[PDB]
Design a binder for these strands. Structure first.
Ligand code: ERY
Lengths: 122, 56, 120, 114, 209, 9
RNA sequence: GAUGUCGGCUCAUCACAUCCUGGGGCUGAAGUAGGUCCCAAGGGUAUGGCUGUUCGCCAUUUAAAGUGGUACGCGAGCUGGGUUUAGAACGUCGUGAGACAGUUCGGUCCCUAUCUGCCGUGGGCGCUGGAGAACUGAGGGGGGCUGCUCCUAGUACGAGAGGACCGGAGUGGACGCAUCACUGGUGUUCGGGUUGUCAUGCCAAUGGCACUGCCCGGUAGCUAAAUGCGGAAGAGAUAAGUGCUGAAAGCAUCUAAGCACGAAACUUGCCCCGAGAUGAGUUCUCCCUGACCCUUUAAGGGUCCUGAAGGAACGUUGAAGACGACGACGUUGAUAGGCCGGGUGUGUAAGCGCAGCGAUGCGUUGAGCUAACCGGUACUAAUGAACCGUGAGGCUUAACCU
RNA sequence: UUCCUUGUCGGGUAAGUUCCGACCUGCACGAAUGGCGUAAUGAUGGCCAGGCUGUCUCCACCCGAGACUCAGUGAAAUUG
RNA sequence: CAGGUGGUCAGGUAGAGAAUACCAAGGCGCUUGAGAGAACUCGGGUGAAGGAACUAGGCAAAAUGGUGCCGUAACUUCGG
RNA sequence: GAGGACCGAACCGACUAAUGUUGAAAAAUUAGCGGAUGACUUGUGGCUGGGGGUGAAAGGCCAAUCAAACCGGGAGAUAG
């Protein structure tokens, strides 16, 4: 259940360490976001040799949530913490060469195909 | 939070119209002792539905 | 909005209801009859009656479970040893409500409550 | 009431093994992969059972590649398959929410061995 | 077409072969019978009156009992009207059944909403609460301003305000139906429906397409 | 209590 | 012989000089996307950073982040940051006390609702004999937003790049309604752990108090963050607009006679209220078929005999309820409590035995305890009655009783 | 203390009329009406951050006291 | 009348203590009650996701909290 | 064992917030706070008397009133 001013753990080797969800993309007066919804985020922290530096602003996709992703059978896959992959701001597609952690099944949506190919679980 | 004017005694009386009491008129004769008492209530002598109870 | 709730707050904190119904339950046993307000009298039926059910079968364990309630050895002694067998085959209906007019002190709904047998 | 319970019991499966909470339990899960319906395993210690007849379900925590992954599963759902108990065990208090904070060696559970 | 009287039993679910879990609300529907057939002649419009269930033989009043006596059949627990589909023509006393619901596809399950009792402005119209602090006093869940000043100088009619909530007729539209078990008189409409458990219900086909 | 203050508009 | 004064919170209502969506004209309109103007107020019409600020700038969204009225809406609704007292200081002015739409720090925001108005809920009476239900719908309110993606189609268009009009399908954001079945929260009335102390004579076992002592859970119920549905389609008459025929005016012209299309606006459809709709309506059903005086002699005043349908009162009550009301039950009986069985929660009681120097463990044992759940049960509490309400129901006219 | 003014530049933040540093074009700083600096101290002013949280997004439920009903006593401001 | 009023007497357990909790001696349940379990208000508990996005302002709540030991920077008037 | 030393009850003080605003109270209560071996606090009894007193200075305080207390008198002051 991502919202404004929410810290998220980085989900890939983009070189970012800590990030925050400054804005929630996708519709007027929108509040919550998650599962796989795009969110632009500031980079509050990053390792020195990484592709990204602190204070950078670019769109990113949620991959994991503490709330978890709901399923038609009523099952839900909760995670210990939130995470997101840094998509390119210009035209999607992840920047990092490796996405850590088990991405959820809901990412299956054409554009996110590059992300799910990495990380063997789920 | 206070009146700008003094109400008529007539206006005061209409408000009192719902204040009137109504007699229950539900008293019932005892099956045994025959003394009058309210329905679904024991007699002062302790009789109730003709059986002896309380005895005080 | 209540909705399918049971019991009554009776303008008192639950810590007192754990006590006020604890002592009154023993008073009903000691004299086999007590005078009390009608709303409270119905509340009493859910207290003393289960205690009578505990008396239906004597055991070392049940004697202590009764001790956790009422907190009087003199009251529980009447249980099992006396009140236990006396109801025998009967299941429930250990006591009955009997309204007895309204109290003079503030028009409070008085209502007698008493055991089915009364043999003292 | 009776109309409800009769409708529920008919849908209930009769092949569910008993299991104590805190036991390690694999949970097979059928899932679409955009085509083929390949089955996938999901082993993990149970942390909270919630029996509600047909509505019954239980959480299955698993610590994978860092942060743990909890997943509830309906007992009678078509999606779930085998519910084998890979490891006998026992813990006091059927709920195990406190384990969510504990990590690594802290997550140990002794075998029930009986 | 005509609807039929129903009765809430309790929400459940029906598992599907694909493994999707679709919620449903059990609704028993004893077969309705037409106590009287309204018409443009004697009544000024064509319609049917129907009833179901088994009211106690002692508690039914003679003026009501004499109405069912005209139908020649034992009294139901209540009475409800359903407008005719014009092309329909039903005889008096005919036992309409739940079998009609096999082809209805979608239905509107009318029911009486639960009584929330008297409620505040927040619960009824989802008004947001004011500041919980920052010097605030005796004002949180309160409606606050309800008008302008000397202009109007009166609260507008129909203004959103605290009052009674629930305990009123409502009708969710285009609810899906799943199973139609005539043998058990079941009516497993998809999703939640208005009404307390055990309350009377009036299921009708959706006007919506 | 009456208070004091000033009505400086 | 007092109209509280900027902004913010909350709550809005109206206007159209229309921000977005809709319908068109023209274009220096290829398409995509614009410019400008007309019609149209149904709905919708940003979160933040700075500043007391409206405004403004910036960051990023969005189909768009409209302009204004409403005492520059709204302090008997809130806030007191500003301004705007009494303290003090800086700059400046004056010999001085002081002053400065110069600045900084600090500085009590009263009122139990009489009427109007509004949100709800009742009592009384009338609707012309009384009563029980189903109603007809005059009228009124509510709902009316929209992206993205796909098909058409990489087609019309275009040099390339790009990329549709009409129509269809799917899925989200915001909003409204309903619901607890799932996922969660609450659960001081359920179980367990444990600290200090007191008490039950003590071992053991329990209880009291310390925010429920501190907690860990958790039934029903309630509830969203949870899941179902809703905006429409259609039709009627139109606004701008596009016309057909056609004279005045041999031609021409959408119009003067006539005729055809045309919008989220209007009238319906959609949902709710509703015959106090005094213009008080319909339909179905039920109940009442006794004997004499008085008076100003009639819609007159009473007595005796009668008291029906039904209602009310009382009691048990309810996922109904502030109080009334409403639904259900009341001995030919499941309304409430209890009870029996089950479920659920807690997770291995008490006692005994065994192992150990001991704290503790094991066996008995998924045991004990289970509130508000479910299925059964008349054990108890809902007494027989009495009460209210009557005894055939005006005048006039017409149509019928074949 | 600077009217112009949110001076300009740099730092902090996705964005900083406040804050820190510097420039000096000091409307109208200035040396006992004391200038500048200062460890410690402060229920002092301003800003940033960690932790923490219903302050908020958005309220939800529960425990007590009033509100409500019955009984007893019984005011108030105001009022052509 | 929930305010104000000096000195003296100083039990048990835990504790550094006259703090605080439970108790002894001893004194009280505070001069209106009985119900119902609506809003709203006051006094409290908890809350999933986020953690100052609230606001004039981290206001209020929340949180930190003991003893023993390890260890502790800029700066300084060498005590901090 | 030094200190207008430190933490912290009594005691003293009254910074924040809520409640209260015809209140229980003509300034309190509740949850926090400052000082607490001293420029401390307090009991008891004196001293300074109205253009005067006193003041670590607010023109505060001098019996709930102080940019000149209260009582009585001039006084039925004057009031365009
Ligand atoms: C405890 C109870 C007191 O109330 C208050 O404290 C509130 C908070 C004051 O506002 C305080 C605080 C404040 C800011 O007002 C909120 C300030 O403006 C006034 C002067 O004093 C009031 C109401 C003031 O009225 C205000 O008078 C203004 C001149 C006009 C205004 N009216 C036009 C609307 C009116 O509200 C004023 C003067 O005190 C009223 C006079 C009659 C009093 O002295 C009375 C005896 C007060 O002691 C009091 C009412 O009992």
């Amino acid at each position: 259940m991502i919202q404004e001013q929410t810290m998220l753990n980085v989900a890939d080797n983009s070189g970012a360490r800590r990030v925050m969800c400054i804005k929630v993309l996708g519709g007027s007066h929108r509040r919550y976001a998650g599962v796989g919804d795009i969110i632009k985020i500031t980079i509050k922290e990053a390792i020195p040799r990484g592709k990204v530096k602190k204070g950078d602003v670019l769109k990113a996709v949620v991959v994991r949530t503490k709330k978890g992703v709901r399923r038609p059978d009523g099952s839900v896959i909760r995670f210990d913490g939130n995470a997101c992959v840094l998509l390119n701001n210009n035209s999607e597609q992840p920047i990092g060469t490796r996405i850590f952690g088990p991405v959820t099944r809901e990412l299956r949506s054409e554009k996110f195909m590059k992300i799910i190919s990495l990380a063997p679980e789920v | 939070a206070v009146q700008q004017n003094k109400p008529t005694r007539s206006k005061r009386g209409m408000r009192r119209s719902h204040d009137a009491l109504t007699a229950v008129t539900s008293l019932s004769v005892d099956k045994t002792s025959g003394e009058k008492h309210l329905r679904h209530h024991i007699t002062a002598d302790g009789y109730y539905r003709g059986r002896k109870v309380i005895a005080k | 909005m209540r909705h399918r709730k049971s019991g009554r707050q009776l303008n008192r904190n639950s810590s007192h209801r754990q006590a006020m119904f604890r002592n009154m339950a023993g008073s009903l046993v000691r004299h086999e009859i007590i005078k009390t307000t009608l709303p409270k009298a119905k509340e009493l039926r859910r207290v003393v009656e289960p205690l009578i059910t505990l008396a239906k079968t004597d055991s070392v364990a049940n004697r202590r479970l009764a001790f956790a309630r009422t907190r009087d050895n003199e009251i529980v002694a009447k249980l099992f040893n006396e009140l236990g067998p006396r109801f025998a085959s009967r299941a429930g209906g250990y006591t009955r409500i009997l309204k007895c007019g309204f109290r003079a002190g503030d028009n409070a709904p008085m209502a007698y409550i008493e055991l089915v047998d009364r043999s003292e | 009431s009776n109309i409800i319970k009769q409708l529920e019991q008919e849908q209930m499966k009769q092949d569910v093994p008993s299991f104590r909470p805190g036991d390690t339990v694999e949970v097979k899960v059928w899932v679409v992969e955009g085509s083929k319906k390949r089955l996938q395993a999901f082993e993990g210690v149970v942390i909270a059972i919630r029996n509600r007849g047909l509505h019954s379900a239980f959480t299955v925590r698993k610590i994978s590649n860092g942060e743990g992954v909890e997943r509830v599963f309906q007992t009678h759902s078509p999606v779930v398959d085998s519910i084998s108990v890979k490891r006998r065990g026992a813990v006091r208090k059927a709920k195990l929410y406190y384990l969510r904070e504990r990590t690594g060696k802290a997550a140990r559970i002794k075998e029930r061995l009986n | 077409m005509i609807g039929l009287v129903g009765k809430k039993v309790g929400m459940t679910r029906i598992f599907t072969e694909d493994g999707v879990s679709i919620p449903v609300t059990v609704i028993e529907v004893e077969a309705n019978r037409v106590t009287q057939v309204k018409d443009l002649a004697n009544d000024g419009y064509r319609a049917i009156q129907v009833t179901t269930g088994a009211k106690k033989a002692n508690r039914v009043t003679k003026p009501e009992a004499g109405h069912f006596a005209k139908a020649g059949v034992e009294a139901g627990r209540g009475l409800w009207e359903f407008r005719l589909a014009e092309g329909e023509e039903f005889t008096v006393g005919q036992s309409i059944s739940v079998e009609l619901f096999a082809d209805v596809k979608k239905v509107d399950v009318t029911g009486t909403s639960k009584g929330k009792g008297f409620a505040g402005t927040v619960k009824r119209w989802n008004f947001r609460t004011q500041d919980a602090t920052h010097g605030n006093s005796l004002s949180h869940r309160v409606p606050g301003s309800i008008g302008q000043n000397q202009t109007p100088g009166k609260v507008f009619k129909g203004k959103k305000m605290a009052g009674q909530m629930g305990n009123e007729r409502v009708t969710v539209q285009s609810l899906d139906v799943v199973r139609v078990d005539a043998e058990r008189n079941l009516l497993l409409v998809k999703g939640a429906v208005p009404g307390a458990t055990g309350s009377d219900l009036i299921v009708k086909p959706a006007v919506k397409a | 209590a009456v208070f004091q203050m000033r009505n400086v508009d």
